[PDB]
Amino acid sequence: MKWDYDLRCGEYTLNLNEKTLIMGILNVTPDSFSDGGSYNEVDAAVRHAKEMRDEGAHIIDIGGESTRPGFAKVSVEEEIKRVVPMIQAVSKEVKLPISIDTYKAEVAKQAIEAGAHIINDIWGAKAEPKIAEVAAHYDVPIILMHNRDNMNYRNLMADMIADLYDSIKIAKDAGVRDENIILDPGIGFAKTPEQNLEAMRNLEQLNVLGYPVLLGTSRKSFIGHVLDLPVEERLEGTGATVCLGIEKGCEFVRVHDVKEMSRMAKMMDAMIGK
Amino acid sequence: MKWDYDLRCGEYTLNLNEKTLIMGILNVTPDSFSDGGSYNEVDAAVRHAKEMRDEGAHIIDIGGESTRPGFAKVSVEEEIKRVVPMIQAVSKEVKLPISIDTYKAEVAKQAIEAGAHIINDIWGAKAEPKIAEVAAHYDVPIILMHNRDNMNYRNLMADMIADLYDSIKIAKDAGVRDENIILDPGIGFAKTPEQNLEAMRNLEQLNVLGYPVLLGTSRKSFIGHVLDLPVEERLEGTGATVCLGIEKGCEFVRVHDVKEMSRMAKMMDAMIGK
């Protein structure tokens, strides 16, 4: 009942009421010597995508080098060379909606022509506002993530909701329809460990804006800060964050460990009555 | 702030505010040919206890054959022969509070003399009311679990709270102090799969009775019913139930997989601000 529309992802449709949707994380393994497109690079990407599809992923999230976790300085002409061949191949042989992980307008634009269905922006359309227009033009869902270039909060949650609505304004002024807007609390970004725990504890507040919320906490540093555990041993901590996130009404979770998280989400959904 | 007393377990003290307490499950591996006490049986019990202590367990729960999951018909004279040597050895070389898993008064009584600190009753003092007196006499914490011999609920939750308070009455009429009372929703017992999901979803209601709540969902059938997964693949489902349980204010979780659940509980505590 909570949502009265389905997420329209070109040729795939995502119901927001039946279950928590699992977005699986695919990071490029760049080939040295080449700028992209090579067989090993692309085929490792496809095999990874297929594994995630089998493990219960509903969306595949595809990131280049300029995005997380790398954040390397690459121009858009090269990032296209790399990210486009992956999107052409994955979209061809894995029938799932694909989101492009970029804050760059031209990269988002190429990705969608290559065959991406959703835009996923870590800067909430603030780094390159034209990205909002790209989304409006192609009529695709855009994920707006909370992020700032500083740590200076008067009031964390109120500041987050304010910051986010600034993103919504930019998106809607560009012509993006409400149904194509998704929000993300930006856990792990521009927050102290203490502020990350705080945002998690108060996540249900994001619900007042009236948009589906995607949660992305997978293997993040704050989990390590709490448990005192390296990145490879953060499965149980990520699981907690996913369970809490779902209890507090999130519609997507973005995770590396698709099998495990998928199982937890399904148990949560059964319990909270999704 | 929520609790203004500590759980007094003889020589160990359990703070109910700092963190979710993990009770690790130890089931006897009975030796054929002997009635109990043999070296392999007892030493496997000790090694298991030590493993759980290292994995982060705060309490060791020790069950004989007449209790779960076996429920075999054994007299109390034999159950004592088996459960007492385990309790003497574990209490000797694992410095943790030990709970005896029994609904039988004489068994509880022997267990405590042998060195058990807490009584854990799956029948909520209704099967053998004298167990309440045993607890009152020795001044030990008693866990009262919801259980009935039928499935006939007018209103699940109201019926559960009613049933439980009937247990509290029997306990207090025997002389058990409020601080020595703990409650358990009896998930997996006398409930359909649908009713188990319901009790989980409405667990916070148990809080109104004003007693610490222990949650025990580890590897239970309903998790299997939801995920469609055999008992060995229920880690992720148990994890969900533990996370939800903690969100809804439970003070203990009783689990087989101490390492994993301990990590999840610790992440939950950090998030909900315990």
Ligand SMILES: NC(=O)c1ccc(SC(F)(F)F)cc1
């Ligand atoms: N490979 C495993 O047995 C394993 C270990 C830990 C986890 S984390 C959990 F259970 F989801 F919370 C999952 C699977």
